């Protein structure tokens, strides 16, 4: 079987679709707050009793690097799936990086390819089945990429505002510009200064939709929206496990579809 643990939805969906039915994948945190998530002794115990723990990046789940198998006498394989990927710093001249690479199809696709290389490396008797499921996912990912890259070039509106800075990589890939009401994390709420900057930014680029998210309180988003004449819609950074039973990419497609509609 091989027990695979996973940090949050994105990691869960990529490792699962790539694993198929071969293993038993579980998710540590399915709720919200991955940014401020901190494991319980039950959680780490779970990680250690696992054969494989998959997480996104130390820049997000910093707690993960604190995990030490050799010491705890565990046979677990801690794997940081975005390690090969290169993160943009949050601000020009800043020691911190933006971890929201999964909302960008291409990076998501290649993160899933790295995850499959791990599964294959830890379970050689199925190495073929893994890379086979990864190519499919990545191919779809490119398919999804080619699609929206066309839809967006046919939209003259390019800017949108989101609840928190979680779509920089998605925007960057489709030639769109974004600004987050909050920072890399939803807890990093705006001072009265930034609010007015968000406002003047909305006015500057005639942004007509402020995208809130199910994870946080839309008060501030509604506020800005009422003061700048823009309306509020919901856009998911996929940090929380989506309702329904769509594929990861299907879930992503649905989100950049609303993006395309609001922007046109
Ligand atoms: Zn985030």
Residue numbers in the entry: 32 to 124, 136 to 306
Relevant lines from the article:
Lmb, a laminin binding adhesin of S. agalactiae is a surface associated 34 kDa lipoprotein. It mediates streptococcal adherence to laminin isolated from host placental membranes and is also important for the invasion of human brain endothelial cells. Lmb is made of two domains with (α/β)4 topology and the domains are connected by a long disordered loop. Close to this loop, at the interface of the two domains, a zinc binding site is observed where the Zn2+ ion is coordinated by three histidines (His66, His142 and His206) and a glutamate (Glu281).
In order to elucidate the role of the flexible loop (Gly123-Leu138) in metal binding and laminin binding, a construct (ΔLmb) was made, replacing the loop region with a short linker (PGATV) and its structure was determined by molecular replacement using wt Lmb as a model. On comparison with wt Lmb, the backbone structure of ΔLmb including the regions at either ends of the deleted loop remains unaffected. These two structures superpose with an rms deviation of 0.4 Å for 247 Cα atoms. Surprisingly, the ΔLmb structure showed the presence of bound zinc, in contrast to two other deletion mutant structures of SBPs, namely ZnuA-Se and ZnuA-Syn, which were devoid of metal ion at the active site. However, only the primary zinc binding site has been located and no such secondary site is observed in Lmb, possibly because of the absence of histidines in the loop, which cannot coordinate an additional zinc ion. Another notable feature in ΔLmb is the packing of the two monomers in the crystallographic asymmetric unit which is different from that of the wt Lmb. In ΔLmb, the truncated loops of the two molecules face each other and form the interface. In contrast, in wt Lmb, the two monomers are oriented such that the loops face away from each other. A similar difference in the packing of the monomers in the crystal lattice was observed between wt and ΔZnuA-Syn. It is noteworthy to mention that both wt and ΔLmb exist as a dimer in solution, as shown by gel filtration experiments, although the physiological relevance of such a dimeric assembly is not known.
